[PDB]
Amino acid sequence: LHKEPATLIKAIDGNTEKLMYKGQPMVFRLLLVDIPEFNEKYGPEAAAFTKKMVENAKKIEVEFDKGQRTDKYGRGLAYIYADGKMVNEALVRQGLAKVAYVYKGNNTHEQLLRKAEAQAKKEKLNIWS
Ligand SMILES: Cc1cn([C@H]2C[C@H](OP(=O)(O)O)[C@@H](COP(=O)(O)O)O2)c(=O)[nH]c1=O
Numbered sequence: 001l002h003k004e005p006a007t008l009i010k011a012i013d014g015n016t017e018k019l020m021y022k023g024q025p026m027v028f029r030l031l032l033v034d035i036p037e038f039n040e041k042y043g044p045e046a047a048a049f050t051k052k053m054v055e056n057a058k059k060i061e062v063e064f065d066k067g068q069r070t071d072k073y074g075r076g077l078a079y080i081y082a083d084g085k086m087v088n089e090a091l092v093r094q095g096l097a098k099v100a101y102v103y104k105g106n107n108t109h110e111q112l113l114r115k116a117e118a119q120a121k122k123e124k125l126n127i128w129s
Contacts (some may be wrong), residue, residue: 001063003062006019006060006061017110027076030101032099035096038099042126050091053085053089056082059084098127
């Protein structure tokens with residue numbers, strides 16, 4: 001797979017956070033994870049973690065997998081990196097998201113993420129506490 005550039009578009013004017021990819025604003029959805037919603041346990045902690053990772057990055061990159069690049073809502077489907085650190089993996093490794101939504105065809109980093117889940121679960125972190 002290939003990492004490609006993007007920049008963070010911060011939330012303003014009642015809009016949501018987005019990434020600018022090829023010079024266009026897009027909502028992205030992280031591949032291979034299920035993240036608690038804001039009203040659920042660890043929802044605020046997952047949002048805060050992601051926001052810190054992306055806001056503090058010098059360089060954001062998006063890495064599409066080999067299958068579909070957008071979902072039925074028009075969201076980009078990608079692995080997102082902040083200064084080389086994968087956000088999808090880091091969230092799962094902290095127990096702030098579960099491996100999920102593994103569609104045949106966009107599963108390149110499934111095993112990496114499952115190992116991070118198993119380590120988060122053994123360490124009884126967050127959702128596994
Ligand atoms: C992560 C992911 C989600 N989706 C769709 C499946 C779910 O559809 P439904 O909206 O019908 O449940 C939805 C879950 O996203 P959220 O977890 O962001 O709500 O996004 C994909 O189609 N491909 C993906 O790779």
